[PDB]
Amino acid sequence: TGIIMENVTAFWEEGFGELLEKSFSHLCLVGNPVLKNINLNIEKGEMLAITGSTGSGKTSLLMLILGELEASEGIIKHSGRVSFCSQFSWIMPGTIKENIIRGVSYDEYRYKSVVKACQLQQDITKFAEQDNTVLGEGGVTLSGGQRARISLARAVYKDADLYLLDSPFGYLDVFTEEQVFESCVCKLMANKTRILVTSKMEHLRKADKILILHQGSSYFYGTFSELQSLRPDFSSKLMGYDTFDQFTEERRSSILTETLRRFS
């Protein structure tokens, strides 16, 4: 189904700061909002790209949809099974395959296609036991991207109506990340309602709707075209760099943040 948030606002409630960690008790006392006057309308099959200054409420907006945070004000509609893929890539003890199809019914196909799209083929081929290689909790010897991709694969493979993808593209193997973005998010999932948190411009360009957060507020919402005209200062500064999307995730974020401060 689609997802809608009409003038939503949420506040810090004890525990949510404890949940996220997977001073808070001051924010809770003061009663400051984590998100404020959040507005969005996504149609089934559309892909929403979320971005913004670091620590602006992106991961939180997600927890909201997940129902781990409630909307003190405003309406929030969406339905069906939702699949979440956190910034923290978690690996459970078992095989690469086991990690991906765990708790869900198997489908030779569906599986092969996800594994392919997520670019896991280039990985499991380096292993003597392919996707049958046994991992130890946390997949410690694996690389950041390898875990991220395995983590994504697991999320994508699940059958759901809404897919919440929190910053999966933030590692050094940037080229692979670009391939994954296309074949998985843009192609393979093209007809699935999906929200993607990111710091890569290209992801905005190719999104149906954009959403830029900053200091818990909505700095912008709307298509990419609307973005260029209604936020010329921002859009100009960001399209300035030739190869921004290949800057470290840290560098990308530090710019978005600084830029967002200048044109608040």
Binding residues for ATP: 12, 52-59, 87
Selection from ligand ATP, Mg ion, Cl ion, none that 57 binds (CB < 5 to 8 A by kind) is: ligand ATP
Q: Which stretch binds ligand ATP (CB under 6 A): 25-33, 135-143, 202-210, 229-237?
A: 25-33
* 144 interacts with, out of Mg ion, Cl ion, ligand ATP, none, CB within 5 to 8 A per kind: Cl ion
Among 34, 82, 117, 135, indicate the residue that binds ligand ATP (CB under 6 A). Answer: 34
Distance CA 102, CA 106 (A): 9
Residue 89 and residue 50: Cα distance in Å, rounded? Answer: 19
Residue 34 binding partner per list Mg ion, ligand ATP, Cl ion, none, with a CB distance cut-off of 5 to 8 Å that depends on partner kind: ligand ATP
Task: Please name which of 53, 258, 51 lies closest in space to residue 169, comparing C-alpha atoms.
Answer: 51
Pairing label, strands 193-197, 3-11: unpaired
Q: Is 193 in the site for ligand ATP (CB under 6 A)?
A: no
Among 45, 55, 74, 222, binds ligand ATP (CB under 6 A): 55
Does 86 participate in binding Mg ion (rule CB under 5 A)? no
Is residue 153 part of the contact set for ligand ATP (CB under 6 A)? no
Among 2, 33, 74, 222, binds ligand ATP (CB under 6 A): 33
- Residue positions forming the annotated binding site: 12, 52-59, 87
| 58 scored as a contact of Mg ion (CB under 5 A) | yes
Closer residue to ligand ATP (CB): 21 or 108: 21
**Residue 70 CB, nearest distance to Mg ion (Å)?**
19
When asked if residue 132 is in the footprint of ligand ATP (CB under 6 A), the reply is: no
Residues 6+ apart with CB under 8 A from 39: 5, 6, 7, 8, 218, 221
Token pair 């900053």 is at which residue?
A: 214
Q: How many residues bind ligand ATP (CB under 6 A)?
A: 13
Interface residue list for ligand ATP (CB under 6 A): 20, 27, 32-34, 54-60, 216
Interface residue list for Mg ion (CB under 5 A): 58-59
